[PDB]
Amino acid sequence: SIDVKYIGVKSAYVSYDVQKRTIYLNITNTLNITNNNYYSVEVENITAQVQFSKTVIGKARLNNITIIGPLDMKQIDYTVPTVIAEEMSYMYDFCTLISIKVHNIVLMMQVTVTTTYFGHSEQISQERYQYVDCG
Amino acid sequence: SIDVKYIGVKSAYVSYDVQKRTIYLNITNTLNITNNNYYSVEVENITAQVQFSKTVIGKARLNNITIIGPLDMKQIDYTVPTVIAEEMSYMYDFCTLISIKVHNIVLMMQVTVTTTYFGHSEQISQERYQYVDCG
Amino acid sequence: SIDVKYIGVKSAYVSYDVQKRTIYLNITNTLNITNNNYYSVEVENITAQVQFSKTVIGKARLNNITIIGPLDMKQIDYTVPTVIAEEMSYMYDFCTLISIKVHNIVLMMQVTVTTTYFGHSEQISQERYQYVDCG
């Protein structure tokens, strides 16, 4: 929700950082902070109802009948990697990768035939990544 | 929602950063901060109802009836990488990548046949990425 | 929700950091901080009802009836990696990776046929990653 911050080297509220081979003399330095946060987030107030069937069938006749709910047959992230060779050869090579399914992250939150949802859903990734270094 | 910031090297409210081989003399420095935040985000008030079926068939005759819910057969991120060779050969090479399915991040929130949703959904990614370095 | 911060090297409220071969003399330095946080997050008030079926069959006749609920037959992250060769050979090579299925992080929260949900769902990842280093 709030202040989802990525900071690569350094973070401060205040910084007086002094780096290499420097001379830093006779400084007078003062700081008078009021820093106040009244975070009232993600506050909720709910009256809810969820009803998948009401049925009245009285004096009826219902002879042949068939009923089926929601039907799911997805394929997701589906693969058939096929590598066919005869003289598959690797010789004297320095830095070599033969990579046929690789992931850093899979996040999945709600994967469903059905959902009813009255909430708050937050999904976050923060990262630094190198696949190869071989200098 | 609020303040989703990506910063490469440094972040500060105030900074007096002094770098390499510098001379920094006789400075007078004062600071009187008032910084207040009253974040009231993602606050909610809900009255809700969800229903999938109400039926009243009285005195009727239903001889041959068939009923089917929502039907899903999607293919998502589907692949058939086929490599066919004879004398597949790699020799003396320095930095070589054979990559057939590679993913950094896969984020999926709600993947569904049916959904009713009364909330707040957030999906965030913050990255620095290098696939190959071989200098 | 709040302050999902990724910091690579250093984090501070106030910093007076002095690095290599530097001289820091006769400094007068004061600090007067009032820093207050009143986090009132994720406060809730919920009244809810969930029902799957209500039925009244009176005087009815149900001779050949069939009923089926929600149906799931998904395939997710499904693979058939096939590598076929005759003289598969690796010789004198220095840094060789054969990778056929590799995952760093796999997070799945709710994978279901049906779900009703009245809460808060948060899924967070914070990382630094190198797949190969061989300089």
Author numbering:
A (entry chain B), B (entry chain A), C (entry chain C): 120 to 254
Per the authors:
Here we used structure determination by cryogenic electron microscopy to show that residues 120–254 of the lysosomal type II transmembrane protein 106B (TMEM106B) also form amyloid filaments in human brains. We observed three TMEM106B folds, with no clear relationships between folds and diseases.
In fold II, these internal cavities are smaller than in fold I. We observed two subtypes of fold II (IIa and IIb) that differed mainly by the conformation of segment A167–I187. In folds IIb and III, there is a large extra density at the end of the side chain of K178, suggesting that this residue may be post-translationally modified. Fold II was found only in case 19, which was homozygous for T185. Although we did not solve the structures of filaments comprising two protofilaments of folds II or III, the micrographs of case 19, the only individual for which we observed filaments with fold IIa/b, and the micrographs of case 21, with fold III, also contained wider filaments that probably comprised two TMEM106B protofilaments. Our best maps for filaments with folds I, II and III had resolutions of 2.6, 3.4 and 2.8 Å, and came from case 1 (sporadic Alzheimer’s disease), case 19 (MSA) and case 17 (MSA), respectively. We divide the sequence that forms the ordered cores of the folds into three regions according to their degree of structural conservation: the amino-terminal region (S120–T166) is conserved in all three folds; the C-terminal region (Y211–G254) is conserved only in folds I and II; and the middle region (A167–M210) varies between folds.
